[PDB]
Design a binder for this molecule. Structure first.
Ligand code: NAE
Ligand code: NAE
Ligand code: NAE
Ligand code: NAE
Ligand code: CAC
Ligand code: CAC
Ligand code: CAC
Ligand code: CAC
Ligand code: CAC
Ligand code: CL
Ligand code: MG
Ligand code: MG
Ligand code: MG
Ligand code: MG
Lengths: 282, 283, 281, 283
């Protein structure tokens, strides 16, 4: 079943401005209510897709946003203009998070520019579909882990110096961690690592008053998709879930708002499943 | 195990909130509504106290009209009504026994008569009778527990279906005990496991009609259910075993329900939101 | 099309009427005295999964008391396979939706076998509906009474007789984990069983009694043509990654594992035997 | 918490089993084999001690020839070879470092060369380095922990694929910590979560080739990994926290692996067997 136009992109991270149709990253009807007023946020991969929607929604809730991303300057710039439109501060932090030192630098830079750090959203990811395990090279395996899970370790480790009672960490996992994906074996393994990391870290930081939770999206129309899958696969993206459609990035943002604010003060170690109705024994 | 609350007990269940010390915090003063549920017509079973009270009030702050079903706690229901009506929305009180199938049908009929329609159903009524082991659960207790905890959810929802359309929503209150078990509430836990599966199954049934079905699994929350079911000693240490080392307050549950009841969760169905102080449940 | 299109106008179904006959026994299954001299009570042990379990348990040396509703022909056949193994077999017909009969099958099991070591709660009925609005109160209560209340009553009666080293196994279902839109009440009963297994495990762990469950996926049994329509029956089990329904004999080793001392460090768990459906297990 | 074992600790990791008091029990003398692995050749990583030794021996009793890959615990490996061959099967020892990709490939090649074929792969190697928090986990430790705990499972399995056919089987040792989390083993836990997802995805990838892929999730088992990774008092209380109030013995894990390795589990793929002393994990 065809859900989107057939399309593919040469390189990854994907570029949102090349997508047809453009992901819906903002809900026009969304009304902010100061849920994150004055909070300082760092978001990895906040330039496009889900991260773009989360940055914009956080801004509408009064948060100042530092956005880390690889090199998609056009996308990062567009996200920044939407964020600043809400009258909050926005800081752009380009660079390769597969490098430990850079993971430390983005936290240091966030604190320098915003004054402090309250909420960290680990959201960066890359994915390289392959027809079977025999087609996953050592080079691809390690690249996939270094960006998808090691960056979450290093960035969070560096943020711990700055987080205090009342602060929050949110990790973007994926439905593939729960359900498996035969063409994304290494990627699913990194998302499964993120789930266990979220559980373990929540127990580690609970007595420090820092909450740790995750969001597990299903198929969401974002740049990650046409940049990883073939056209035919892209054209059918989202037809498999019970709502029979891919999710739009704005549909993920309120889950992050919920987890980031005092609204979830009694929530830690959990996962919010936003996936069109796929039952995962959640 | 350690003290979290004052030793207290109520000799009748459903419990009366006005008799609690400290009174549960059912409202967050800092909560700012933003029309998330503007003009929506809601039916909440057990919306007179505890979590249901906090949900009724938060929904009112979001602009929803609220029909509250409850057994017989008029004092608690009238108090809840005062807070709902403070928000300028309509509140309808529906007392009566939801262990009676006909009464489950009547509350839906009455909600539609008074509010004009029904958009969001929150199944939330429950009773619990702790026992030291299975051998202390009579057939009478087993049946009573299931009739109110899960059969009412079936009967009320069933009646609600002819009134729900595309964009409507159902939320079911389950419990952490469905996921983690509780050796002293074996029948009760079984009812909560039934709700979890009911939620999963009904979500798949209604997805093509555009009706979402989700749940909330609370951990230990300070509500009338606690002193009315547990003994004084266990009450005094309630919530001490969870990683945050305190029971939750009812106002801490309301936002999960708001999320699930509004367009904010448009891509969410068949799911459970665990609000339990940090207990990992492989969620 | 996985199976021949068929339907039975009565439930519980009769295995002897099915085409093909489910494979309830594995020719190569070799016993190794895993349950030698153990006294077992299995509810719904006359056919389908229950019959496979009775036979495998007999091959492991256990004496089997089989409770079933009224399928004398199916119960008699199961009894012949059990007795072929040189162990004792007791047939206990009757309706387990009645509390007193649940107590009676336990008493009768202890009378005939001398004691009770392993209880397998496995009885079930299912009535598919196109929606919730087609489930009567009669169907709802009957489904719960047999599917979960019998599990409470039989198990409760068994507690006087179980000691350190004894075991309880509850048959749940994949539907408790994944949901089933056509079986909403049945699914709720199976979710009840999962929580019941979890809670009871923690209640009995200090008494040395283990409690675990099995969650089968689509299994070719008399429950299938007796409940589902003929074109659903013909497509049965095509929805799982193994693209076939399971045979009852494929369920039996999971029960052997959970019943014997091979699972001495396992309580409160579920073994998922479902053709590869991932359930976040 | 309370004392379950003697206070003890070992200088290096991987640990040495012959140093432990009491010696783990790796065999159940009452366990009788019944040819459940008739004519099969197995490769077990980490099969020299702890759970891996218990599995090696049980597999031998079921009729399997066993190739055991391990790091450098020659004493433990040789003792294990002795137990295996005593059951009337062949045993091949494959020492070396599985954090190296090429070595992962070589152990598979050597197994086929010496045994003739490969039918069952059991990925079971691990290392763990407890730390009081995330700030105490260096990049060096993070990468080392991943390279051996999960990348080795990728490389060994990948190399094994050209040798596996319909009816063959993969089993991956995960851990309760992927489900419950562990605050002193944040990196280890993450490798275990990766194993759970690897198992799920790989089961779906190989199901049409007729190869099943499942996992075992142990709870606290008395093995050389414990005294070599934890401090003395921690070791002394090992297992006190699960409902059975004791750690498991390695022989208590073997039958789960036998179940998954044999045609007894022909209708099982993509699953986990939780052998943990009663910890509820929403399984
Ligand atoms: C993919 C899948 O299974 C389904 C679903 C689950 C989880 N994910 C998660 O959402 C998150 C990303 O969201 P997205 O889908 O909105 O795509 P996106 O491409 O808009 O955002 C991912 C970002 O990661 C950043 N990034 C990648 N490599 C980097 C590097 N080396 N250094 C610094 N930054 C780097 C990029 O800047 C990029 O914008 C990821 O954690 C991803 O796994 C998305 C989907 C989906 N879009 O369908
Ligand atoms: C018990 C447990 O696992 C802990 C936790 C999880 C879930 N629960 C769930 O929260 C919901 C109940 O809320 P609560 O804790 O706010 O207590 P509550 O007593 O304030 O609300 C329950 C309501 O059930 C209604 N009710 C009971 N019997 C009735 C009947 N025969 N007819 C009509 N109405 C009847 C009463 O009107 C009562 O107000 C239930 O679904 C309960 O299982 C609460 C807690 C907790 N308070 O700690
Ligand atoms: C059905 C489903 O969702 C998938 C799957 C999961 C679990 N189940 C479970 O397997 C178990 C055994 O069923 P089966 O499939 O082997 O079918 P079966 O009909 O052979 O066994 C069920 C038995 O329940 C007994 N029974 C029914 N009502 C009774 C009563 N009132 N009093 C005493 N006994 C009564 C009957 O004696 C009958 O033999 C049940 O717990 C069932 O829920 C089976 C399947 C399947 N057959 O595909
Ligand atoms: C720690 C924990 O979560 C609890 C529990 C769950 C899972 N684990 C799992 O069980 C397996 C470990 O077995 P064990 O507890 O029997 O410990 P063990 O030390 O007896 O076996 C682990 C083996 O890993 C091998 N190994 C380590 N590094 C290697 C390398 N670089 N190259 C080649 N081989 C290497 C060693 O040869 C060693 O014998 C692991 O997969 C581990 O994650 C054990 C326990 C436990 N023993 O309590
Ligand atoms: C053939 As290769 C580079 O995946 O080992
Ligand atoms: C610490 As609080 C205000 O969430 O009870
Ligand atoms: C009649 As109406 C707007 O509640 O669906
Ligand atoms: C002894 As009785 C009434 O719980 O069956
Ligand atoms: C403080 As460090 C060198 O372990 O990242
Ligand atoms: Cl097999
Ligand atoms: Mg981008
Ligand atoms: Mg009340
Ligand atoms: Mg029958
Ligand atoms: Mg060793």
């Amino acid at each position: 079943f065809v859900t989107m136009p057939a399309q593919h992109q040469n390189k990854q991270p994907g570029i949102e401005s090349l997508m047809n149709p453009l992901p819906q990253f903002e809900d026009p009807n969304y009304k902010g209510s100061e849920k994150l007023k004055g909070k300082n946020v760092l978001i990895t991969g906040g330039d496009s897709g889900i991260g773009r929607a989360v940055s914009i929604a956080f801004a509408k809730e009064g948060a100042n946003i530092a956005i880390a991303y690889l090199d998609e300057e056009g996308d990062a710039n567009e996200t920044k203009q939407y964020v600043e439109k809400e009258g909050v501060k926005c800081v752009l932090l380009p660079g390769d998070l597969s490098d430990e030192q850079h993971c430390k630098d983005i936290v240091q830079e966030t604190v320098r520019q915003l004054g402090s750090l309250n909420i960290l959203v680990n959201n960066v990811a890359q994915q390289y579909p392959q027809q079977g395990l025999e087609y996953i090279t050592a080079e691809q395996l390690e690249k996939t882990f270094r960006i998808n899970i090691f960056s979450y370790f290093h960035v969070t480790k560096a943020a711990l110096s700055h987080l205090k009672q009342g602060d929050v960490i949110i990790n973007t996992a994926s439905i593939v961690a729960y359900e498996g994906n035969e063409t994304l074996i290494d990627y699913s393994a990194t998302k499964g690592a993120i789930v266990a990391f979220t559980r373990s870290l929540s127990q580690s930081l609970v007595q420090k008053g820092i909450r740790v939770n995750g969001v597990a999206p299903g198929p969401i129309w974002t740049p990650l998709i046409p940049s990883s899958f073939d056209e035919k696969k892209v054209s059918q993206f989202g037809s498999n879930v019970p709502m029979q459609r891919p999710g739009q990035p704005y549909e993920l943002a309120p889950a992050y708002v919920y987890l980031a604010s005092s609204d979830s003060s009694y929530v830690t170690g959990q996962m919010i499943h936003v996936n069109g109705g796929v039952i995962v024994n959640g």
